Amino acid sequence: ERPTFYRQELNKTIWEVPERYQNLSPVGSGAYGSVCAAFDTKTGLRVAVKKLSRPFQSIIHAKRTYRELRLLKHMKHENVIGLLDVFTPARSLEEFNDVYLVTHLMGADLNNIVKCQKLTDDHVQFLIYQILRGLKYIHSADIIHRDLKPSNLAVNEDCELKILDFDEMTGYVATRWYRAPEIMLNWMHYNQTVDIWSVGCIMAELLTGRTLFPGTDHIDQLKLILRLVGTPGAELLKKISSESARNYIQSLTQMPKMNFANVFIGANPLAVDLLEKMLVLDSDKRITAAQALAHAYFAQYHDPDDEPVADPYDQSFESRDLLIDEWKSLTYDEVISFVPPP
Numbered sequence: 653e654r655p656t657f658y659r660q661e662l663n664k665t666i667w668e669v670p671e672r673y674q675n676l677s678p679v680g681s682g683a684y685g686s687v688c689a690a691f692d693t694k695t696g697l698r699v700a701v702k703k704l705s706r707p708f709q710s711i712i713h714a715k716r717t718y719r720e721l722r723l724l725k726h727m728k729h730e731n732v733i734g735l736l737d738v739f740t741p742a743r744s745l746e747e748f749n750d751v752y753l754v755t756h757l758m759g760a761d762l763n764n765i766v767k768c769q770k771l772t773d774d775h776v777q778f779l780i781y782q783i784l785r786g787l788k789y790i791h792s793a794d795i796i797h798r799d800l801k802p803s804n805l806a807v808n809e810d811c812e813l814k815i816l817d818f819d820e821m822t823g824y825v826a827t828r829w830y831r832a833p834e835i836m837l838n839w840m841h842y843n844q845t846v847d848i849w850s851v852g853c854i855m856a857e858l859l860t861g862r863t864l865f866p867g868t869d870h871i872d873q874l875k876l877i878l879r880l881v882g883t884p885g886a887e888l889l890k891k892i893s894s895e896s897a898r899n900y901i902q903s904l905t906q907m908p909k910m911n912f913a914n915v916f917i918g919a920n921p922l923a924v925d926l927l928e929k930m931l932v933l934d935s936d937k938r939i940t941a942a943q944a945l946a947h948a949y950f951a952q953y954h955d956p957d958d959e960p961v962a963d964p965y966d967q968s969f970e971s972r973d974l975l976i977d978e979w980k981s982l983t984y985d986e987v988i989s990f991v992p993p994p
């Protein structure tokens with residue numbers, strides 16, 4: 653059952669992978685691992701291989717590693733990054749230290765596309781549709797991304813897209829320009845429609861070519877947002893359980909929702925309509941992914957028999973308070989239990 657492993661050093665790091673993976677070539681200085689481009693001789697696919705660094709250094713990190721592996725083992729969808737392989741050179745649990753992950757090699761993020769390319773309404777349709785198809789799947793598993801943004805979106809030459817990666821929030825930084833107001837300002841217990849807000853921001857950026865809410869801080873970004881969508885009504889104010897947040901909002905001069913047709917001049921009216929149903933301040937009233945797939949803006953791509961949902965995602969491990977060795981053992985279980993796609 654054991655494939656033969658071989659060793660090589662790639663910038664002060666020993667990589668031990670099965671013989672099937674060839675021409676390993678470093679590609680990105682990550683923060684939870686190093687990543688190589690490789691060629692998988694068995695599938696004939698070009699693959700990305702990640703070596704998780706310090707995966708079991710503390711209870712926190714060992715749980716994170718377990719969670720990571722669980723999410724990826726579970727995500728089986730065309731528009732969501734899943735796992736072609738996972739392996740360890742270790743022959744037993746006692747020597748088990750390293751986790752390697754294998755997935756499809758993707759050419760660029762969406763940032764590297766919207767910066768370089770000029771996007772027709774047709775390309776925007778296909779990209780957004782793909783995001784929504786992936787989200788419908790993610791949300792059906794009771795997972796919220798929380799941080800959808802162009803650098804989390806992998807695209808290749810065919811414009812095929814996959815969703816990825818479910819002080820750093822301070823200033824004029826992309827890290828915050830796509831967050832929903834209620835998650836950015838902790839208004840309430842937020843739901844999965846925070847991701848729909850993010851899609852709205854992304855979609856707008858693809859159409860206009862510029863960031864929709866390039867706030868220079870939390871307050872400035874709120875101001876940009878409300879300038880477009882209007883200040884909260886009485887009903888939405890009730891739902892903002894944070895007394896600190898609610899009191900601040902009421903201090904602002906009230907504003908009406910702007911006419912979107914006047915902001916995004918020249919755009920497809922159907923794109924304008926969809927944006928209006930995505931960028932609704934009240935998260936309860938936002939369009940869902942499943943609903944957005946049926947919007948007439950995607951009538952050319954929409955396929956109700958080819959927009960699948962997810963298997964039950966057993967997430968009950970989150971409540972668990974275990975020791976390092978116990979998370980690591982559960983991780984090892986998920987490693988050896990892995991069955992590749994057909």
Ligand SMILES: CCOc1nc(N[C@@H](Cc2ccc3c(c2)COC(C)(C)O3)C(=O)NC)nc(-n2cnc3ccc(C(=O)N4CCCc5ccccc54)cc32)n1
Pocket residue numbers: 679680681682687700701702724733753754755756757758759760761762803804805806807816817
């Ligand atoms: C750490 C990032 O470093 C990095 N740099 C480059 N550089 C490319 C250009 C480029 C630049 C940015 C960029 C993309 C490309 C593609 O989409 C995204 C959004 C990544 O952004 C280049 O120079 N090619 C010449 N490519 C990649 N990469 C390429 N396919 C990847 C697939 C997944 C991931 C991954 O993170 N996971 C995480 C969990 C799942 C998993 C499982 C196994 C392995 C990695 C992973 C990384 C990938 N990662």
